[PDB]
Design a binder for this molecule. Structure first.
Ligand SMILES: *[C@@H]1O[C@H](CO)[C@@H](O)[C@H](O)[C@H]1NC(C)=O
Ligand SMILES: *[C@@H]1O[C@H](CO)[C@@H](O)[C@H](O)[C@H]1NC(C)=O
Ligand SMILES: *[C@@H]1O[C@H](CO)[C@@H](O)[C@H](O)[C@H]1NC(C)=O
Ligand SMILES: *[C@@H]1O[C@H](CO)[C@@H](O)[C@H](O)[C@H]1NC(C)=O
Ligand SMILES: *[C@@H]1O[C@H](CO)[C@@H](O)[C@H](O)[C@H]1NC(C)=O
Ligand SMILES: *[C@@H]1O[C@H](CO)[C@@H](O)[C@H](O)[C@H]1NC(C)=O
Lengths: 476, 183
């Protein structure tokens, strides 16, 4: 035996690895990149007007946003056809773009009594417990009346400053440029962006009927309570009419095959628990074989949930003069790509289970298996001092650099210091006593004394392993 | 060459697919006047593939030869621009020419390519290649002509030595790694 058992589980795994490769080949095409790039270089790179240089990426005031809304925005959405408006003469703008704002209410924080004669009013930072819900200005339409999240069919966004809800004051722009511009001018005249505003969303979607691939676009502008403007963007190439070409039928067949494979792998792994070895996990080849199954189950459930309800597309196709609410699908597509990309990584890592075909591949794995116990002990000691530097940098420089503004950024900056990437031209500006001292001590202690021990140990281990084999050859 | 979904067939009246040999145009368009509006096969054009950035374009297509001087060339390209010679179906455009530059003896062949992807936009790509016709000019050449013959003789000697060695050692000659690098 041992060739009808340790090889059958390899041939059944090679087919799995081929089906997974076929499934991950069809997800990422080559036109998707240019489709996103052309749209990205249309709203974020053109200057707001011919006489200025700023674009959406470098907005720095509430007047720049107004210049962008009437200007570089309307020049991209509406194109005179050689009535609908194809963007690049292929990208059909379906529906109408929608704009929305979220604002806080007056008198929302506490003014110290000492200087209350100067501070007339304040507006607190954004929070669900301090969000305005009352009409303001002329109470004509839906742009001056608080509409809840339930009847907006909205959802949270998790922006940069905070996490904004799906309610607020919204307005659906028109279908032709000459009246959308009038609506924007009316919004600008009767001041719609007061100081109490905290967020603004502009969103739409396009089709590009040549290939079969939608594209939803959302642009966010955040106004922190400490003044300023922070822009953000998101372009997502959805696809909702999949079953058209024969290749789509082939992909459907290959994914039913994947479902069958995951069923087989879950049953033949349950069979090895109670009908066989009980409660032995510390092998790293069964702890990994469970992660793949769980991730695949999650990714299958997400995929079924995503394509089980496309009713928003049907509603839009019923009447094509409204706003297509494609925001939900664009989120689950990202959440599904984030899972289907991690499963492939672990499936590829699983190939190490079968590379022992000669007497020189066995010791190269024995070395790692015998130095993975000693490296783990030193890793904790390394990463404790790593975090000790990270938190000190966060507390000292994390106010005037922006390379240490948040703790994660502090960690990534040190990882980039290890690569020798960042230059310390501005570190000393935030502080001079601890400016160059921090850099020098960090480099010295973690690039000449602590980063080596990871090498030495490994080297030593390798040596003994070789002996621990060579002597065994001398015995025979 | 495209399949609109039935759901929104009324809104899109036509779509053009991504370039592919199985989905190329072969019919005249616009004023069917001359060679710029009639499909010509690759054989009749003496062309070949290119392997551009988006795909691999064939050698056929709709072509036009310009004039020898500026005036008629400008008039002819303006006549092309007056009509619509670059419709929505156009997928690639090639411009080819060659120059001599007699001042220093060095030819040059120039090919420019513009690709219009099926998602709108323009992708340019150029290629210059200088050629030379220096054979037996000054008194420095003959040296290279003799060196070429010497090199050919050396290769003949090396191959005959290699065949002798491989005849003596009928096999196991393909493991020293100093024989693979010699063949
Ligand atoms: C905001 O409230 C403060 C205090 O009530 C006062 O300045 C005024 O009522 C409001 N100011 C506005 C709406 O500009
Ligand atoms: C409110 O009335 C119309 C729309 O109902 C609007 O155009 C007008 O500007 C508003 N009136 C004002 C702001 O006084
Ligand atoms: C939310 O969805 C319902 C479902 O029909 C729709 O009637 C309503 O108009 C949507 N909300 C908005 C603000 O369009
Ligand atoms: C493209 O072909 C379709 C198929 O009938 C036709 O309806 C449409 O008018 C054509 N468009 C052009 C520009 O010829
Ligand atoms: C077609 O060519 C003739 C001469 O070859 C020219 O007189 C005529 O104007 C051309 N057609 C058009 C539409 O220009
Ligand atoms: C292709 O080569 C033939 C052979 O000389 C020539 O007659 C023909 O004109 C060439 N094609 C073109 C488009 O010039």
């Amino acid at each position: 035996k041992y060739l009808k058992s340790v090889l059958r589980e390899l041939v059944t795994y090679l087919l799995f690895l081929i089906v997974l490769c076929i499934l991950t080949y069809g997800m990422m095409s080559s036109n998707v990149y240019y489709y996103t790039r052309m749209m990205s270089q249309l709203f974020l790179d053109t200057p707001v007007s011919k006489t200025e240089k700023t674009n959406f990426k470098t907005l720095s005031s509430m007047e720049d946003f107004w210049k962008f809304t009437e200007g570089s925005l309307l020049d991209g959405l509406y194109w005179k056809m050689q009535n609908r408006s194809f963007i690049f003469y292929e990208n059909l703008l379906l529906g109408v773009p929608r704009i929305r704002q979220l604002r806080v209410r007056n008198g929302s924080c506490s003014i110290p009594q000492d200087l209350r004669d100067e501070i007339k009013e304040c507006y607190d930072v954004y929070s669900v417990s301090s969000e305005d819900r009352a009409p303001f200005g002329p109470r004509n339409g839906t742009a001056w009346i608080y509409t809840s999240e339930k009847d907006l069919n909205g959802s949270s966004h998790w922006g940069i400053i905070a996490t904004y809800s799906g309610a607020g004051y919204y307005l659906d722009l028109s279908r032709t440029r000459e009246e959308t511009a009038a609506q924007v001018a009316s919004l600008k005249k009767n001041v719609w962006l007061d100081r109490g505003t905290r967020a603004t969303f502009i969103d739409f979607s396009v089709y590009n009927a040549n290939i079969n691939l939608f594209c939803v676009v959302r642009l966010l502008v955040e106004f922190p309570a400490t003044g300023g403007v922070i822009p953000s963007w998101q372009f997502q190439p959805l696809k909702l009419i999949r079953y058209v070409t024969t290749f789509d039928f082939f992909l459907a067949a290959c994914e039913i095959i994947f479902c069958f494979f995951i069923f087989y792998y879950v049953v033949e792994e349950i069979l090895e628990i109670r009908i066989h070895k009980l409660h032995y996990f510390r092998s790293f080849w069964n702890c990994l074989d469970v992660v793949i199954v769980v991730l695949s189950v999650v990714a299958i459930g997400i995929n079924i949930y995503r394509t089980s309800n496309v009713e928003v597309l049907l509603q839009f196709l019923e009447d094509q003069n409204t706003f297509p609410n494609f925001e939900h699908l664009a989120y689950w597509q990202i959440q599904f790509n984030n899972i289907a990309a991690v499963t492939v990584f672990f499936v590829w890592i699983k190939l190490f289970k079968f590379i022992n075909f000669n007497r020189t591949m066995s010791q190269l794995s024995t070395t790692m298996s015998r130095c993975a116990k000693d490296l783990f002990g030193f890793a904790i000691m390394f990463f404790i001092i790593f975090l000790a530097y990270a938190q000190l940098a966060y507390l000292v420089f994390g106010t005037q650099v922006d390379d240490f503004s948040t703790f994660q950024e502090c960690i990534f900056t040190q990882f980039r210091i290890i690569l020798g990437d960042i230059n310390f031209a501005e570190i000393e500006e935030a502080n001079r006593v601890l400016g160059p001292i921090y850099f020098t001590t960090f480099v010295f202690f973690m690039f000449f004394i602590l980063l080596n021990m990871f090498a030495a140990i490994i080297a030593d281990t390798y040596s003994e392993v070789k002996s621990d084999l060579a002597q065994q050859k001398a015995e025979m």
